[PDB]
């Protein structure tokens, strides 16, 4: 997170850490959407261009963490993966379209003051809240510039209009993704960076006080560059797929 700040304890109890077992390292961020299912970005697990293809046995998920490097005993929970489900139409060859993946845990996790699931957007929340100008929240242990935070970071960013997103990059933007961030003229900075990918973009509902995950940190040219915006996987539009694999494999 570029230009963010230290997250408070428990302010993002759905935050998950995708951790590589050997050698030990932070791969990506992710989120808790149920007691047995975790949501993250597809390019975090599969990406042929870089010869990247992590399977269940290469990883472990760490829930309820705050410190980036310590083994927060009795607070964080480590879980193994039973199965990874990558979107069949994930487009890594052209524009990271449908950059999403589901991970089922070997055993359910117990919730606490540091571990609690986030909400998935519904028709009402999605149509009502995903509008330009409104702002969400991005969290993660990624780099502070394009070096590493000792603790979970947080930054609030405003959603940007399709046009401005479209003409900010030469890549083919799709409807399965939106962009967020301030404009050069708005005089404020902030963005996700190496390591936040896969993390959630949440919004707090003014109607029922609940937090919803509108997006997944997907990609972006550089980190916090003027005239540039971060792109996130549109979770709502891919909800039909999410629900499908959870009803059939959960």
């Amino acid at each position: 997170i570029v230009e963010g700040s230290d997250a408070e304890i428990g302010m993002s109890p759905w935050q998950v850490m995708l951790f590589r077992k050997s050698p030990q390292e932070l791969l990506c961020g992710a989120s808790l959407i149920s007691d047995r299912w975790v949501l993250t970005a597809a390019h975090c697990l599969l990406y042929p261009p870089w010869d990247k293809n992590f399977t269940e046995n290469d990883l472990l998920v760490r829930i309820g963490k705050h410190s980036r490097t310590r083994y927060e005993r009795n607070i964080e929970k480590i879980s193994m993966l039973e199965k990874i489900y990558i979107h069949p139409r994930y487009n890594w060859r052209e524009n990271l379209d449908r950059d999403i993946a589901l991970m089922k845990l070997k055993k359910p996790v117990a919730f606490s003051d540091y571990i609690h699931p986030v909400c998935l957007p519904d028709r009402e929340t999605a149509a009502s809240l995903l509008q330009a100008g409104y702002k969400g929240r991005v969290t993660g242990w990624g780099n502070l510039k394009e070096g590493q935070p000792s603790v979970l970071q947080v930054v609030n960013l405003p959603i940007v209009e399709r046009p401005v997103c479209k003409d900010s990059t030469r890549i083919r933007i799709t409807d399965n993704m939106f962009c967020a961030g301030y404009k050069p003229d708005e005089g404020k900075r902030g963005d996700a960076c190496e390591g936040d990918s896969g993390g959630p973009f949440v919004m707090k509902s003014p109607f029922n006080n609940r937090w919803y995950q509108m997006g997944i940190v997907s990609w972006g040219e550089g980190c916090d560059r003027d005239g540039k915006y971060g792109f996130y996987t549109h979770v709502f539009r891919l909800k039909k797929w999410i629900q499908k694999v959870i009803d059939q494999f959960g």
Partner: peptide, 29 residues
């Protein structure tokens, strides 16, 4: 999923965020 998005250390005890207030203020601007 029945208790989704309700943080035990915040919402669940009428306590606010250092910055959540900023998100709600954008619903009017």
């Amino acid at each position: 999923e029945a208790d989704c998005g309700l943080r035990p250390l915040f919402e669940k005890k009428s306590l606010e965020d250092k910055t959540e207030r900023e998100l709600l203020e954008s619903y009017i601007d």
